[PDB]
Design an enzyme around this catalytic site. Sequence first.
Site, PDB file in Angstrom:
ATOM      1  N   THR A   1       0.844  -1.216  -0.098  1.00  0.00           N
ATOM      2  CA  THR A   1       0.007   0.052  -0.016  1.00  0.00           C
ATOM      3  C   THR A   1       0.953   1.164   0.046  1.00  0.00           C
ATOM      4  O   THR A   1       1.997   1.454   0.697  1.00  0.00           O
ATOM      5  CB  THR A   1      -1.034  -0.109   1.089  1.00  0.00           C
ATOM      6  N   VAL A  30     -11.103  -8.337  -1.751  1.00  0.00           N
ATOM      7  CA  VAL A  30     -10.847  -6.655  -1.478  1.00  0.00           C
ATOM      8  C   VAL A  30     -10.345  -6.361  -0.050  1.00  0.00           C
ATOM      9  O   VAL A  30     -11.244  -6.901   0.875  1.00  0.00           O
ATOM     10  CB  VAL A  30     -12.318  -5.995  -1.802  1.00  0.00           C
ATOM     11  N   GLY A  31      -9.313  -5.717   0.043  1.00  0.00           N
ATOM     12  CA  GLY A  31      -8.730  -5.075   1.343  1.00  0.00           C
ATOM     13  C   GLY A  31      -9.540  -3.608   1.549  1.00  0.00           C
ATOM     14  O   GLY A  31     -10.585  -3.287   1.006  1.00  0.00           O
ATOM     15  N   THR A  52      -2.680   2.307   5.600  1.00  0.00           N
ATOM     16  CA  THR A  52      -1.972   1.205   5.324  1.00  0.00           C
ATOM     17  C   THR A  52      -1.956   0.170   6.421  1.00  0.00           C
ATOM     18  O   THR A  52      -1.557   0.621   7.615  1.00  0.00           O
ATOM     19  CB  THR A  52      -0.672   1.358   4.724  1.00  0.00           C
ATOM     20  N   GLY A  53      -2.508  -0.998   6.423  1.00  0.00           N
ATOM     21  CA  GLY A  53      -2.205  -2.022   7.465  1.00  0.00           C
ATOM     22  C   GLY A  53      -2.915  -3.452   6.940  1.00  0.00           C
ATOM     23  O   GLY A  53      -3.247  -3.415   5.799  1.00  0.00           O
ATOM     24  N   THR A  54      -2.702  -4.096   7.897  1.00  0.00           N
ATOM     25  CA  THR A  54      -3.624  -5.709   7.993  1.00  0.00           C
ATOM     26  C   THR A  54      -5.366  -5.233   7.528  1.00  0.00           C
ATOM     27  O   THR A  54      -5.856  -4.432   8.496  1.00  0.00           O
ATOM     28  CB  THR A  54      -3.720  -6.083   9.387  1.00  0.00           C
TER      29      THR A  54
END
Lengths: 135, 134, 142, 144
Positions: A1, A30-31, A52-54
């Site tokens: 990301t 899908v994130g 940005t992350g998990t």
Amino acid sequence: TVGAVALDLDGNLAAATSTGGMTNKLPHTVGPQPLVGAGCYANNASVAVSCTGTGEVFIRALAAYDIAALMDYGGLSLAEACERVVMEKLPALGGSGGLIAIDHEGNVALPFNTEGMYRAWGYAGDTPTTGIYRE
Amino acid sequence: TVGAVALDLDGNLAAATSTGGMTNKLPHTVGPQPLVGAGCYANNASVAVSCTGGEVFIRALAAYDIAALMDYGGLSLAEACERVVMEKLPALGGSGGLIAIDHEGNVALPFNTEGMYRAWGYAGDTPTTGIYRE
Amino acid sequence: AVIAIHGGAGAISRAQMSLQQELRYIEALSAIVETGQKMLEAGESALDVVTEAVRLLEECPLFNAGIGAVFTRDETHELDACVMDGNTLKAGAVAGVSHLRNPVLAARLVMEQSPHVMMIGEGAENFAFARGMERVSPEIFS
Amino acid sequence: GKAVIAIHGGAGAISRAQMSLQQELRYIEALSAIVETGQKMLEAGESALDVVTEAVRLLEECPLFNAGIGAVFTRDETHELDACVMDGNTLKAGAVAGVSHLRNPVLAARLVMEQSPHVMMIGEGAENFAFARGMERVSPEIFS
Ligand code: NA
Ligand code: NA
């Protein structure tokens, strides 16, 4: 990301984010990056956010809108909102990551709860700051 | 679009939504129904919400906006539903409704459309059902 | 302990509607909210109740879900569903599925047996079939 | 008040021990070139939207970072890209998810925001939409 947030001369805020997802990710997943309010939110009244992350955690947390709502409704500072989301709410739900955020007044924050975050910021006509590690 | 929110005896909140999208939907468009906090949101500490309407409903995050107005803005369920559905959405040229239950068992079924197929009731009590306004 | 359900919000006119048509909607909403009450009173999870309510609203042809789902510009069915557990704050969603009778059931499965919140079409379908969910032709929604 | 840009290139488990100063300066050099392009644009009086769009376009084009070129692989050795852009002035947003044949998802995402009543497009729908508005089709091998 990867992400960008910006306040222009005319008082306008904008946010953008792009990613290739978590390595080895299941296709057709899908994130939070393409979801208004998860990966990305901008409102001229409040803040511009790019996270940005998990992924699961940033979707379920609506990280990017939650900054804005803590400021616009809770009256929190950008820095209090960022401390709340990134250092308190996310780790509690198992989310490691960070975000970049600019508010309507031109305050900047780059919170993260990870070892590092590739980041950079600076004013117009001024020099940039760049970071990788904490501090 | 259809929806259900519920508070169980143990104090758990849950929300659910299912749809076929807009009649004559351009294929491979995502409405608000699959998007967490747009079509749908549940939190035991706040509220459960299921919305129906979806461009404006995506960008407006109507479902989580209810929780945030309550949790951070100190609004009641009824104040929050009044705000999102009857002020903010109409203002943004967005027509629909939602169902909401807060952790205290307050129920709300706001909509800004001519009608909304809706029903609700406490356990052991007899249900209430509705189509048009009032 | 309480349940609310909806079957869409939009332009419904008393004109171009007979009382008998209106009763089929009233009967339907009414039967599903009762099923929900009974379950709640019996001590069923708020998740189980919202899942089965939406499953019933899907199965009912009067509502735009499962059977009675609207058509796309290209005369197909693309169903979306989501579910969220206010207790664990976990969520599960499927978007653009054609081969699952009950998208809300697939959404729960995504919530419970997946790290992912949101799955799309063939991804969502294959995910669901790999955990024993039956494949259907989209004909059943028409 | 004062026009300003922040950018990020991802967050996670970055070890001092797994890096030489010179490896690190690649990221610093890259980060500082993108933030500077953004600064210059803002200072020149350009919209916050154009500035964030160009910033993420450049972060995508930069292989050091997991977007567009340098994007990670899926379980099936392919590349699935998501991007989103939001204008705090109009409150308009655009997003693409699970796209593989677009060099620059952020550019497709803006395109959805600007020439579409839709907020979010996925896979072929997103790509067909993008190709029909003169955006080039690419092999996902370019991201590898
Ligand atoms: Na139905
Ligand atoms: Na890149």
